[PDB]
Every structure is written in structure tokens, then in C-alpha cells.
């Protein structure tokens, strides 16, 4: 079973979920999946300390609510596993300054500059085979491959060289007000996105404002060139209900845009309400969250420590007694 | 309540009699007055490539040498940096409270050469700040080459405390031995010309040979007189002898009246090499007792970790991490 590593920022849209996470939830027996809530990456940007703590627990409960199973997979909070920072320092010594400077000055903090090395350590600790990345993480993954190959050439094969996982994604979900732009969790305009915790009244409101077209009479037809918004609304509904585009075009024959939007909103919220019930149950049980964090960190450290031991032996450290 | 003192010991090279007589010899006798911490910094060492087994051996060499000098593991905390994970943990965290420009203005860093150095060489001042701040250190006894590093640690501590309240203590800073063949240049652990240097582990014979070649002057006739400007060589040998024996410069001047530079060199070799023979005796017994060094490292890492973990827990609480359950 291939080992898969994903870092989860403690800060998700229906795009993240239906395009990737929903299917990964069903892949936990074919793969050894690892989910790392990267609170040590989050602190490269200031925020109120209690907000970060709350958001770490939020993120853990959301992943559990989505269906990540702590027995089948390894899920944990990065700072609870000291090996991440330990390996991260060691790998600084096998990273060129020029590699970090060429991926994005006197007033930024050194964590902003150095966090690609920590990311490399996150991955390499677990003998990871596969990393699912957004396109904006491509050069970070490539650095981790180069560090692994460079270290291996010096000391022998210590690290697995990880590969990108190409999704075979469940859906492509576009921004509600920019149907040519992919829906992104980092979008500063939140009316483009539907977050997984949004209530049905918020969902209907964002769906009702989604851009359509000026066709008269209005017609529900898939056409990415001339009807991008209506096409995106059909793709969202298809991602939720599994119906093909032709079935949906038939279902909405003789219907206006208001009706398509209402049914998309109702279908999205039907999906999210089940997710939110599970979320509230996990999030409101902090005793259970602590057990998951405790179990996951010790499972993670058990494997991470085997890799660090090999790394420390290879670079020349006296083994800890 | 005793002030906390933190020193980082590089597991590489050879300590000189300048290192010893100028600093380490006195700290050996201050172990009851201060809470002294000695950290053998193997995580800093790997910013420079070397054969891995050499670094492992050098780590043990350095431990055995600090013990031979008289660091008492029952009075002071002595340990190997990599055995205490909190060093790397706080080191990462403090990256996020360090300005890029602070590291880029480090004198040794301050284009093409820049791209080729490893990121550890760029980032180790932050790890150094972590090393110090983990132990609520009050005093860091450090040489001139580390003044900029100590100031960065003070800046980081102050800017972290200003954000989060009082978490870190703000540290403060705390003989005359010149190069044997260049007596205007201080004797340096890092000198490429070994003949300038007397290492703590060189045996009498090599020490004696190096001392007899030490530069003096061409005064006619030769006179053992103290004068740093005009007789730097003779003056260095007098200062070395004075640092070893505790005799004043006036006492030695009288002692050498009518004597020649060869007599002065002979006394310096005897006095120095006497200091070294006692030191080496302790070194070889400690160094060959692997059981003993293991127990010292285990104990010291345990004591170090107990303090560092308290600090890191407070740092992690202040920053906003969920506490490890
Ligand atoms: N709007 C979206 N529609 C479909 N899939 C998405 C969307 N956003 C992210 N993904 C998936 O999630 C991963 C990237 O997520 P992120 O890390 O948020 O960029 C990739 O595997 C994508 O297939
Ligand atoms: N040749 C020397 N004479 C006197 N003190 C020295 C000498 N070399 C090093 N030291 C002391 O050793 C400490 C640190 O040495 P270093 O960092 O190697 O220059 C400082 O307290 C110095 O004063
Ligand atoms: N850089 C990633 C988070 C991350 C940290 N370590 C990782 C390792 C693998 C994948 C992702 C990560 C992000 O911003 O989203
Ligand atoms: N930078 C120091 C070693 C060191 C690491 N951490 C320290 C903390 C305090 C004093 C010294 C250190 C040197 O090369 O000599």
C-alpha cells in the first residue's frame, strides 16, 4: 500500500471536498494515508494565538466529519510530533540557499523563507510515496524530491523519493461569480466559494447570486464557451447527485435559472447538513479530539522516529542513550 | 538563586590553551556559584560537511575533554544538543519571529556565493537563539565572533515578549595568549597554521617543539623584558608563563635577569606541558570509558530536557498551538 502524505492548514470549500477529499475518504484501505494539521506552517503568518488553537481543533473535527478514520489513516497535529522540527533543521543543511530564494523581503520572517524545508521534512519523515498537491505546491514537492535524492547520494538510500499524486478528481468546481476561475479556498472574495460549514441560508444566498448568462429565453444547457455559469451550476449539481449532464439537461427542460439555482442550493446543503451534524458531534467532544490527537501523534512519531534515527545515524550524531 | 549560564561547545577542532586559560579554566571553578549548562552543538556542526563517523567521534572527544577540564556533570548540565528535541522545535518556532534581513545582515553572509551555501549556514543564528532561550539563560560567555549572534537572541526574546507577555529571559554577555609564530595575532582555534597553536591534547614533545620555535626578537643583547609593542614575542611567552603559574610579570622579569630567550622557552614548555599532561590523563580515562560517557549524556539530556520542555510548553501555549495531550 502506497504511503500518502497531506498537510492540512489549520484555517475548505465544496471544491476541495468533492474534487479530492471525498474520494480520499473512500481510499483509506487501498492506501496508507497520513493527514498532518500543519500548525508549525501556520505561524509563518501572525494571528491571535487562541484563534490558531481553535482553528487546529476545527480542522481536526472537519476532517473526521468528512470521514477520515483515525484507525485506518494517521491524522495528527504537526507540533505534537517533534521529529518534524528535528528533521527540518537537519535538512536545512542539505538545502541550497538559492533553492529557497528562487521560490519567493527584509521584513518577511525567516519562517516564510525556510518553510519549504520543513515541508520537505514533513513528507520525508514517513517514507512517503505520494503527495496530493495543489498546483501552487508543485515547486515545494520538487524541492523535497531534490533534497531526498541529494541526501541519498551522500549517505545511501535513507529517504523515499516522493511523487505527485494526480487526482482523477471527482469534480471540477468553478467560482460562483467568476465561472472561468476555479473555486479556491484562498480566494479573498468569499462569495466565490461555498465553505463546508456554511448553513443552507448562506448557501442559497451565494447560489442565487452566481453568475449565469443573458440567454432569452433562459435555457439550462451545458456550454462552457457561452454559458459558463449555468454549466458550472450543472457541474456542481452533478458532483453532488452523481447524475450525468444529459440527465440534468433533461430534468431542467422548460425551467428558468432561479429553479436551477434553488435545486443546486438544496442539493449542496443536503450534502453539507450531514457533514455539519458529524462536525458538531466531533467538535463538541474535546475529550475525543484529545484521544485522536494523542493516538495519532504517537502513531506518527513511531514511524517518524525510525526515519530520524536513520538520518541521525547517517549524518554522524551520537545516538541518544 | 544562581544565574543560569549557557555555552555551546562545537564538536570539532581542538581547544587551545588560549581557550582554556582565558575562559574554560575559570568556569570550571565557578560551577557552585552559577547554574552552568554546556551544550555540545552537533546540530550546528552539520552546517559544514564532514565524514559522519568523524562527527560522532568528535562529539565524544569534546564531551571527554570538557570533563577532563573539570566540568562536573553532578554540578553542571552537560549534554549533546541533538539529544534534546526542544532545540530544533524552538528553533523552527523562532524562525517565525526573526526578520530575514537580520540573518542576511550577518557579517559573514553580508550573490553567486550566496546561492551555493546551505540554508543551515544561513539559519543557524536562529537555532543559536533557541539554544540559549530554552534554558531561561541569564549569561552567555561568548567570544567576539558571536556578539552579533547573542544580540539577535536578545532581539528575538524582546520582540516575542512584547507580543505575548513575559515568556523568555533576555540574556546578557559575560589570560592573554598570542600566536606562537605571529605574536601580534591572538592565538586562534581556527588558525590554518597549526604551529601558531597549542592544543589541549598535544603531548609534551610537540608542545615543546612548538614553543622553542616561538618568535622572540633580535634585541642585542637579548633581555627578557615585558614590552608588547617592541617585544611582542617575548611578552607573549611571559604572559603564557604568567597565566600558567600565577607569577606576576615583574616576578618573571626578575627571575630571568641575565637569562636568555632559550631559558624562557624552556620554562614555558615545562609549565604549559605540565598543565596538559594532567589534563590528558583525565581525558584518556574518560574518553576510553564508553559506559561512563553514555551515562553522562543520558543524565545530562534528561536534566536539559526537563528544563527545556517547561520553556517550550510555555512558548507553544503563547503561540497558540494545541498542547500535546
Ligand atoms: N474548485 C475545485 N474543484 C475541484 N477540485 C479542487 C478544487 N479546489 C481544489 N481541488 C482539488 O484539491 C486539490 C488542491 O487543493 P488545494 O490544496 O486547496 O489547492 C487538488 O487535488 C484538486 O483536485
Ligand atoms: N588566545 C586567547 N587568549 C585569551 N583568551 C582566549 C584566547 N582564545 C580564546 N579565548 C577566550 O575564549 C572565549 C571564546 O573563544 P573563541 O570563541 O574561540 O574566540 C572568549 O572568552 C575568549 O576570550
Ligand atoms: N504548504 C501546504 C501545507 C503543507 C505543509 N507540509 C505539507 C506536506 C505535504 C503537503 C502539504 C503540506 C499548504 O500551504 O497548503
Ligand atoms: N555558534 C557557536 C556555538 C553555539 C551554538 N549555540 C550557542 C549558544 C550559546 C553560545 C554558543 C553557541 C560557535 O560556533 O562557537
UniProtKB/Swiss-Prot annotation, chain A:
Q: Which domain of life is it from?
A: Bacteria
Q: Which GO BP terms apply? A: tryptophanyl-tRNA aminoacylation
Q: What is its EC number?
A: 6.1.1.2
Question: PROSITE patterns, per this entry?
Answer: AA_TRNA_LIGASE_I
Its UniProt entry gives the catalysed reaction(s) as: tRNA(Trp) + L-tryptophan + ATP = L-tryptophyl-tRNA(Trp) + AMP + diphosphate + H(+)
Cite the binding residues for ATP: 9-11, 15-16, 134-136, 173, 182-186
Keyword Nucleotide-binding listed? The answer is: yes
Extent of motif 'KMSKS' region? 182-186
Q: Which family does it belong to?
A: Belongs to the class-I aminoacyl-tRNA synthetase family.
What PANTHER family does UniProt report for this protein, alphabetically?
TRYPTOPHAN--TRNA LIGASE, MITOCHONDRIAL
Q: What is the protein's name according to its record?
A: Tryptophan--tRNA ligase
Amino acid at each position: 500500500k502506497p504511503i500518502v502524505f497531506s498537510g492540512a492548514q489549520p484555517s475548505l470549500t465544496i471544491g476541495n471536498y468533492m474534487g479530492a477529499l471525498r474520494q480520499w475518504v473512500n481510499m483509506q484501505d487501498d492506501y496508507h494515508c497520513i493527514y498532518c494539521i500543519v500548525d508549525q506552517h501556520a505561524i509563518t503568518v501572525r494571528q491571535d494565538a487562541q484563534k490558531l488553537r481553535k482553528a487546529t481543533l476545527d480542522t481536526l473535527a472537519l476532517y473526521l466529519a468528512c470521514g477520515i478514520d483515525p484507525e485506518k489513516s494517521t491524522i495528527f497535529v504537526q507540533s505534537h510530533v517533534p521529529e518534524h522540527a528535528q528533521l527540518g533543521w537537519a535538512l536545512n543543511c542539505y538545502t541550497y540557499f538559492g533553492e529557497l530564494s528562487r521560490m519567493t523581503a527584509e521584513n518577511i520572517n525567516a519562517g516564510l523563507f525556510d518553510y519549504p524545508v520543513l515541508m520537505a521534512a514533513d513528507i520525508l519523515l514517513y517514507q512517503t510515496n505520494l503527495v496530493p498537491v495543489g498546483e501552487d505546491q508543485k515547486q515545494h514537492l520538487e524541492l523535497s524530491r531534490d533534497i531526498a535524492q541529494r541526501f541519498n547520494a551522500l549517505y545511501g538510500d535513507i529517504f523515499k523519493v516522493p511523487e505527485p499524486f494526480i487526482p482523477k478528481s471527482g469534480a471540477r468546481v468553478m467560482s460562483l461569480l467568476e465561472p472561468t476561475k476555479k473555486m479556491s479556498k484562498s480566494d479573498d472574495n468569499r462569495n466565490n466559494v461555498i465553505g463546508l460549514l456554511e448553513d443552507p441560508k448562506s448557501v442559497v444566498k451565494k447560489i442565487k447570486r452566481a453568475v449565469t448568462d443573458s440567454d432569452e429565453p433562459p435555457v439550462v444547457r451545458y456550454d462552457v464557451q457561452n454559458k459558463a455559469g449555468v454549466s458550472n451550476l450543472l457541474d456542481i449539481l452533478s458532483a453532488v447527485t452523481g447524475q450525468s449532464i444529459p440527465e440534468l439537461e433533461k430534468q431542467f427542460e422548460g425551467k428558468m435559472y432561479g429553479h436551477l439555482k434553488g435545486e443546486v442550493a438544496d442539493a449542496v446543503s443536503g450534502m453539507l447538513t450531514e457533514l455539519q451534524e458529524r462536525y458538531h458531534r466531533f467538535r463538541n467532544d474535546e475529550a475525543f479530539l484529545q484521544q485522536v490527537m494523542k493516538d495519532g501523534a504517537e502513531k506518527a512519531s513511531a514511524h517518524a522516529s525510525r526515519t530520524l534515527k536513520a538520518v541521525y545515524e547517517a549524518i554522524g550524531f551520537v545516538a541518544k542513550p
